[PDB]
Amino acid sequence: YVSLADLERAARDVLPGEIFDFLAGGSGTEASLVANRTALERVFVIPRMLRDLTDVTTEIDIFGRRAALPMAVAPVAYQRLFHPEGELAVARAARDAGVPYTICTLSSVSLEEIAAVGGRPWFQLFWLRDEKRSLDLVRRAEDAGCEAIVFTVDVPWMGRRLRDMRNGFALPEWVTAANFFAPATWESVEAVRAHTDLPVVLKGILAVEDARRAVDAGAGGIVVSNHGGRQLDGAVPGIEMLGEIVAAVSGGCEVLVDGGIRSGGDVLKATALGASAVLVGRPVMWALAAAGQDGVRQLLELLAEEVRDAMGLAGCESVGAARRLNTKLGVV
Amino acid sequence: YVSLADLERAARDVLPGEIFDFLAGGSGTEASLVANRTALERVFVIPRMLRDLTDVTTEIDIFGRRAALPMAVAPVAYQRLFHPEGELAVARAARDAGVPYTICTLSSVSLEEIAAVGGRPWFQLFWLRDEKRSLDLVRRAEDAGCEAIVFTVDVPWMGRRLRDMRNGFALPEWVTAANFFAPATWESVEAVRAHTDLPVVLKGILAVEDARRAVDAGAGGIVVSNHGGRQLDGAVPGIEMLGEIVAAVSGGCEVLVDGGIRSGGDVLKATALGASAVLVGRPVMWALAAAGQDGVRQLLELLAEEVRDAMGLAGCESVGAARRLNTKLGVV
Amino acid sequence: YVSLADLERAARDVLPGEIFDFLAGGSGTEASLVANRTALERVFVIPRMLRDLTDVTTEIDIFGRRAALPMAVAPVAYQRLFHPEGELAVARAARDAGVPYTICTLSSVSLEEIAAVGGRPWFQLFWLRDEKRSLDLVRRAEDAGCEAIVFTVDVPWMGRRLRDMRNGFALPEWVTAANFFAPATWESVEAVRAHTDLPVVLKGILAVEDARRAVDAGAGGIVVSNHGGRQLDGAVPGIEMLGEIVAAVSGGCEVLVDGGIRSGGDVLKATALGASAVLVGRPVMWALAAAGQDGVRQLLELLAEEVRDAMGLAGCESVGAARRLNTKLGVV
Amino acid sequence: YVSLADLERAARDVLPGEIFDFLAGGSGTEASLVANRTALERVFVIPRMLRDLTDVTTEIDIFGRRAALPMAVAPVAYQRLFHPEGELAVARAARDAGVPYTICTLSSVSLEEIAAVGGRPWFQLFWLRDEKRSLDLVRRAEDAGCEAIVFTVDVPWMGRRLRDMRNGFALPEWVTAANFFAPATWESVEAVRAHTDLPVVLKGILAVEDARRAVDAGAGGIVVSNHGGRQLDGAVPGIEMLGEIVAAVSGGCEVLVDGGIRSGGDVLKATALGASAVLVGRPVMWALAAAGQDGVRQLLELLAEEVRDAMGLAGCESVGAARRLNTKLGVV
Ligand SMILES: Cc1cc2cc3c(=O)[nH]c(=O)nc-3n(C[C@H](O)[C@H](O)[C@H](O)COP(=O)(O)O)c2cc1C
Ligand SMILES: Cc1cc2cc3c(=O)[nH]c(=O)nc-3n(C[C@H](O)[C@H](O)[C@H](O)COP(=O)(O)O)c2cc1C
Ligand SMILES: Cc1cc2cc3c(=O)[nH]c(=O)nc-3n(C[C@H](O)[C@H](O)[C@H](O)COP(=O)(O)O)c2cc1C
């Protein structure tokens, strides 16, 4: 594999069509799904030359741990849909690559099993039917050694997935929500923040004022995201809000972005727009479908190579230097 | 049906080609017809998160009546072209959905029959050969219980419909103008305003100064519209003028928009640009052609579901909150 | 024929391919040829409603004569390539339509014969090998009753016509320059201006400062034009410079535009951007090729109908009112 | 051949696919390779009319020598891949056309042999494993009569060439680096500047501050360039940075540009954006592949004709006048 698109082609060959569509699809007309890619394609980096590249490092410190790249595996539900080892395969490869893995509330293997793999596990939370149950789930994740709570804030309910409707898609009997909802509010965020000393990261922020409120609420981070185009069809891409959000929070929390990251060059664009790190979703599942744990390992090695290549070609010996690069919009 | 495009495909299968073209077509090169869609596709919504969605409501109050959605059925002529029950089927489904139905001056069933269906009937007026006849038609609509006069102001004459020319299209003998023209001016508007206490809504306004003059003239509303691309070929889409018009009238009348609304997400975009409500034309006729009254019912139920979905995903418990959303133009 | 594109299709069917290419082609990569169309397609008109249309007139006064439309036939060389009656057929139809006809220096029938047809003949000048010969040609045109000298200023030499090169195109023996060059300068313009009391119109102006200098030089008009994309490949379309040029000359001369006008709606866009009138080139030759004089008559009747339709739908009872319309750029 | 695209078609017919891909390809997704062309296509020139064209000259003075055109042959490695005479064929044709030829550090014929052809040889430097070896290579070039050192500053290492990976491309045994690396820094530039009195030209500058630093460092020129899209995938095209860079250096060094120049009209656009000269890479190799030295001669004669044509049509009797032309961005 020499590009992430090689992995997409391999996953399409192996997966049943309805499972490929569950993974690939977005809500509605898929306008936001497509716009995540268009938005990245219109950004161009202005590289710097002739800087010292003696010790180029792709590492970052985030949520109290060193990560090998400015990236984490996004929370993706039900990973046993894509390979029999599901989340365990992905978490093992992420651990070995030094990349944080986000355990999903809707994981097909229990959070405690995935956490036992080791590595840097984060836990993605959906707000449950009441406060008490929600907080018990946070406390399970904390007791199991998860290092951040990624509270998803853009799913009062799941969006309208027309591919799933048209396919009549349902989980096979052999895939379940192994950790087993009401809409979250700012009060829910405060209940979580008071229940844990782990950093709380709000995933799905797009409005500048919501990013500011997240800092005021005590969030340790946010993920600027339209949920991979799966939630509001017509929601702006996160990459189009990122620069304005980074300026508004002015260092008050970590600012991650996701949606459409498909190369180390896209990582570099995100960092040059001010992101602390990215999440990557679909490509990790393509690699899992294609070749299991070893597939995920190969993807992460490829992304690491692409990130180091892009950083050095742009004159950046560190991720901080990449955040100081300038960009220019172009017409594609 | 899971999208309005499913209804278009079904209507194309059933209707004679020349009738499908009468419905689908625009004037000239169809530049304005296409631009209505392009313009909506370039708008992206910036959703809000973590707001209370305990009692999401899609209802609005407009022209003195509660409507179930921020939408009405646009005036479309000669609906018996599309199904034998024509306007009666559409009006019955609109009544049952709580959606206002605009009775056309060129209806193929008399306005009194359509009004007897009940619901929230509005009446669309074309200015007749003289003032006296025009006002008699307004008074018929008022006597029959219509609740607003939608005065169409962009048809001094019908535009050049090249599909109809090329097809040699003419009304079948079994379709007539069952209520049975000179160009309207501002004096015509004043004659109508003085003849009725019903709200007068000027449909087809695109210039900011014409919107301001409509308020000064005593209009209770305007529809920002290029007539679905059927009038001036090269007229700007209404959605591209909407924000500037909403700012200029500054609450002095209701501001509706139409042209190309094809989903609840498009309704949300229109409201976020400041519209009080939208009109929907062609899709309602696709549903009528496909399955009669029940088809229209299914379309309106689908639109209601899409509007509620889009509003809640964007953090809006009411249409007023959706009008306070911000948008960003993107490149598609 | 219901659109100018119907005429293009008919001309393509009848003309030898190399003659069709002589007519259709531009210089180089044809970037400027294509951009003339793209530029018009991105302009949208903001129409006005409810104005008095009792006496809509498409007439203008220009260069001391009333014309039936804000348009003239552009100078196109060698019209016997397209039909045996060549320039005489076109000039007869233009006369009968009340539209000025521009006689070309490279006409295939002598200027005196074409002028004898009557109508409103203008004469297009290329600067000859010396001043004396050039001025004799101006004086021939004046003696024959031409009413303006359209001095072409963008042909120090003809551009690189790759279609003509690839086809090995040459004039058939039966087509000649029946009126029978050195590059023109501002001194040439002054020599022409002092030699005639006819208005001198500089055709091929694109720079704002050249438009201002044209007024200072005593020009009665300019044509804002890239020569139909046939001269500098990469020259900006005239329609993209028109508004800035109209503001800079501030009524000091007539400002015409050409390139890509293909409908009455395009005429309306040009006038709303400030043009006094347009020239139309290729479509007139399509009509000539398709059906001779009667073809040109049908084209001019179609354009007249489209111009009146577009003006009235936009609320304009006169061309002056159309020049006061506003426009908005869109994304096509 | 009547366009550079004719040469591309001829080269594709003759070259082995993997060699054509080595020549054509870029890094990563080839976003920067494509953007070099898109960026030029969006620039339009505003030509001037009626200027004296008695003595149009395409010549420039650069780095102390008169060149026949505002262009040089870019450094392209391993030219024996494309024709058995390789660099000697290209250098002979460049000499006879009066165009500088840039000898590559990775040439397949030694720099002394290529310099013995005569003409205006420049030498492109890659920084070697240490300072001493690097400077010996500079001194070889100087001793052999090269007239400028074109220090490539955008290759700390070669980018990721996915076509070469997919083809498994490697140099044939019959092609070697006949002059036989560590990443360059500003200290390397100063070591070169102190080692030679030849002008040092930094090739691969895209950031405005790097252009300013190049002047401060004593560079005699820069080439604004993304390395033909072969280095950072997502690097901005040089043509999009050129105007801002020309303003920032404000005459302190020569400012060249490359990437995607495919006609004399593209040369004119580059000069109107402020370039002193362009480099041309791939097209020169297409001509070499197609027909050897004579092919390169024909390409250079064609480019000379196109440059003179474009300059005169734009009203420019000299390259300096072309640098004073204005441009407008369009939508393609
Ligand atoms: C099949 C699928 C399931 C989920 C389930 C979840 C989830 O239960 N909680 C959550 O918080 N985010 C989810 N997501 C979004 C994900 O975390 C990233 O936001 C996007 O995948 C980033 O875009 P890509 O890298 O995929 O373009 C999903 C994405 C995909 C594709
Ligand atoms: C076949 C057809 C007939 C009419 C007749 C009328 C009319 O006698 N009076 C009027 O005032 N508007 C009309 N219209 C315009 C309509 O009311 C809406 O303005 C557009 O349909 C909105 O765009 P879509 O939702 O269709 O995109 C029509 C639209 C269509 C398609
Ligand atoms: C075959 C052909 C010959 C000529 C010869 C001349 C000419 O000897 N003198 C001149 O001054 N303009 C010319 N022109 C340009 C013309 O007058 C208009 O500038 C463009 O035709 C407007 O664009 P279209 O309406 O064609 O798009 C020509 C245009 C075409 C197509």
Ligand SMILES: Cc1cc2cc3c(=O)[nH]c(=O)nc-3n(C[C@H](O)[C@H](O)[C@H](O)COP(=O)(O)O)c2cc1C
């Ligand atoms: C096969 C190939 C090899 C090299 C090797 C070198 C090199 O060892 N040093 C250098 O400094 N630049 C190089 N280049 C870039 C070149 O010098 C120009 O920057 C681009 O070719 C301009 O774009 P095009 O005219 O090709 O679009 C190359 C370009 C191509 C195509």
